[PDB]
Amino acid sequence: NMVKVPECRLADELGGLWENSRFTDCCLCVAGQEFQAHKAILAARSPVFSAMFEHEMEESKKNRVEINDVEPEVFKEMMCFIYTGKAPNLDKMADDLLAAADKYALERLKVMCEDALCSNLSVENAAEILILADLHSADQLKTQAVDFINYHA
């Protein structure tokens, strides 16, 4: 225990990779905005992206994937999660991020959003959150939501 070993920095460096966009091989177009990314990473991280890049006929697309169901700011948080496993701005978009994580099968990000939404459960938004968990198959969130509503009988 004499030698001081530095903290793992895989996440920070992969984040650098995404921020610097080097050796990118695909373009994601989100509401008219273009983002360069790396197929290998997105595929190893999302079963949806994986399937998309693995079974895409029509070179006409030219590695150009157009995303229509996600707002640019939410998209960026999702990407941040894919490259580093973190989502610094999750708190202010938990519900939209949940839907994006669900759509792109990012299980851990999905549960992280569930965790944040659960923590904000109130009698004013209990029902809405409950419905939200049903539309994006967020089990843990639903259960905690049902329990909440019941308890407040």
How far apart (Å, rounded) are the C-alpha atoms in residues 107 and 44? Answer: 13
Site residues for a second copy, 89-118, by CB under 8 A, read 107-108, 111-112, 114-115, 118
Among 52, 53, 89, 105, interactor with a second copy by CB under 8 A: 53
Among 29, 31, 44, 51, interactor with a second copy by CB under 8 A: 44
Supply 74's token pair.
């939410």
Among 27, 39, 52, 96, interactor with a second copy by CB under 8 A: 39
The residue count for binding a second copy (CB under 8 A) is 39
Supply 50's token pair.
């994986």
How far apart (Å, rounded) are the C-alpha atoms in residues 143 and 115? Answer: 12
Within 13 Å, how many C-alpha atoms sit on residue 76's CB side?
10
> Can residue 34 be called a binding residue for a second copy (CB under 8 A)?
no
Q: Residues 116, 140: contact at Cβ < 8 Å? A: no
Q: Which alpha helices (H) appear in 21-153, and where do they start and end?
A: 39-45, 47-54, 72-84, 94-103, 107-119, 126-135, 139-151
Single out the segment in contact with a second copy by CB under 8 A; choices: 27-35, 67-75, 91-99, 138-146.
Answer: 138-146
Among 30, 65, 67, 84, interactor with a second copy by CB under 8 A: 84
The residue ranges that bind a second copy (CB under 8 A) are 2-6, 8-11, 13-14, 16-17, 20, 22-25, 38-41, 43-45, 53-54, 84-85, 107-108, 111-112, 114-115, 118, 140-141, 144
